[model samples]
Target chain A: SSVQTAATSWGTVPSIRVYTANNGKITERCWDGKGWYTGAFNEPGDNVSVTSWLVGSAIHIRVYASTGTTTTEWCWDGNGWTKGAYTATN
Target chain B: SSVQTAATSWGTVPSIRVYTANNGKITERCWDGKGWYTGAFNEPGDNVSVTSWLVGSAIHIRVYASTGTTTTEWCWDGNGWTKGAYTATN
Candidate 1:
């Protein structure tokens, strides 16, 4: 876990869906506002650095290179994570 | 606001104490895990960039200069804000 964590209240439950680079793969752990659960995202990487922020009901995660303006953006719309900009469903 | 916001759970109660530079002063808004409230910190600045991260039971905020490593640190240890690093209270 880097010095920062992306915590947000994207909905009423305030669930958690945090991603961590474990074993060179992007794995996620979730919290159901009560108990913690395992997530099923398996992206590729190794000691990769990342940053995140929230906008409205969506969250944007930026995967930085060993160095960036060249990075990857993964956006979440409360349903699924997409590897692109935020395309809201409203 | 910048792209990053420092959100952490430094206590049993998930409260809030977000700082922003308004009217050349660093004003803050707090949330007591439920309702939000205003703060009384009167630090001076204008459009100043800042950064923050949580450690154990404390949060360290850095007020960066127009340019480097030149910055001022304000650490909060769940009791009061101090102008230095995080010191534990055993």
Candidate 2:
């Protein structure tokens, strides 16, 4: 497993969040003005892709996992995380 | 899979690279002081985790995938991308 961080200048978005990948499980944490807020881990597959964006007062995160040839994704919309399938070509 | 972008200040690292996931394939693109440079796609597993960091004049990216209980990672340094295995527990 590994962890990483970043700094940004988005309104009320002081700094960026931290990303962690462990045993095929990926999780994220954010800075909420005071300290980092604990976020839930979304384990979509044995392999995964993770990324985030700071939009206004909210942070959006997306996680991707593959099952056979089809790929699926889970997204965090500041409030909660949502799961869905992605339509990708080759 | 989906796409996202970010802005930052890390010298020469004008803005962040965009992340895109498609059918378990993850790739990145960045603004190299002039135009956006296209990156290659890395497919590690059916599921994946991805993230990036801007340090000084370079952009670092990481992609994660799971094979059974073992998780693996591929990272992009300033020059190119590298692959390795991650020691993750649970």
Candidate 3:
């Protein structure tokens, strides 16, 4: 997968998404009020995607494998990306 | 899989990205100007990923199967999570 891109707003903030791959290996990155941060998925492969949202002054993100059968999510609250939890339904 | 998170901005509005998994099962959630909304992907497997972009007040989302070889996208425009289309280049 090439470097995927996406953007949104977190109240009055500018949120950006950028992810890239090398020789089928993939990684994820994001930009919020703080700065750009990078991270990896639970596994490795070209089958990956990224998305984000903003809560108050915090920006949250989710990255998952299209073929790996799992996902990894993080957040940036004008500071750094931190692992967190979310509510789920059936 | 477990609950995953990501966030960004939608102009002046706070955008949020959240998803979760149970025993390898997966689902997605998002927050725009509207309240919290939930949805799923094309297939029921852990090989899935989610990403989003803000177009005006609408948050356009893409959920795909990394290993299944395809993607399913949706959007939330302060109303609800509705299925939509995105441009993909191989």
Candidate 4:
């Protein structure tokens, strides 16, 4: 997806949240731009996986996995990732 | 542009509008998920051209022209088209 910026300040909106679905569970996380959470990667379904995040003036996103044991997909504002068909083979 | 959807109804907002300038005439069109309408063109100097629009649930756009006597550009909000330097020729 193309990078988008806001022209006006919406002010104090919730941090953009992203979650990933894997093995029937949702792994969720919130991003504040500095770094990954010390407790990132929620267990499947217990919480939504924050696959990506952008908030305030900061942004953080994990590089796409190439070879991981668990395959995953992510969502934003209740919408799933744009690349729908691609499997998280890594 | 890819089709976009509203998670919740914003409620009867203005329809999307697009405008193009040819020979100093600004052609404007509002798409309400319906048909085009009267007085579609605005004067070039009298108004700001709404290059592209996505509002409510309706959308419309004009195809790029290949060859024409005049060259023109478009804008949205205040930002111009994604493709710059390519003059609207037809």
Q: Order the candidates by lDDT, highest first — what do you get?
A: 2, 3, 1, 4
Model 4 ranges with Cα > 4 A deviation: A1-90, B1-14, B38-41, B46-90
TM-score of chain A of each: 0.51, 0.55, 0.46, 0.27
Worst 10 residues of 2 chain B by lDDT: B1-10
> What does each candidate score in C-alpha RMSD?
11.6, 9.3, 7.6, 15.2
Clashes of 3: 34
What local lDDT score does residue B42 receive in model 3, on the 0 to 100 scale?
25
lDDT of model number 2: 0.51
The digit string of per-residue lDDT tens for model 4 on A23-73 reads 544344444454444224343332121122344443323212111232222
* Local lDDT at A26 for model 2: 51
Q: Which stretches of candidate 3 lie over 4 Å from their true place?
A: A1-75, A79-85, B1-11, B21-25, B33-37, B40-43, B67-90
DockQ of each: 0.05, 0.07, 0.17, 0.02
| lDDT assessment of candidate 4 | 0.30
Total backbone collisions for each predicted model: 0, 16, 34, 16
> In candidate 1, what are the lDDT values of residues B1-90, reduced to their tens digit?
212212222333434344444334555545455665665544554333345567775665554322122344555545666666423232
- Candidate 1's displacement at residue A42, Å, is 2.2
Winner on TM-score between 1 and 4 is 1
Per-residue CA lDDT of candidate 4, range B1-90, in tens?
A: 111110111113323333333343444433343553433334443212222334544332322322234333322322323323546443
Give TM-scores for every candidate, taking all chains together and pairing residue i with residue i.
0.36, 0.40, 0.40, 0.23
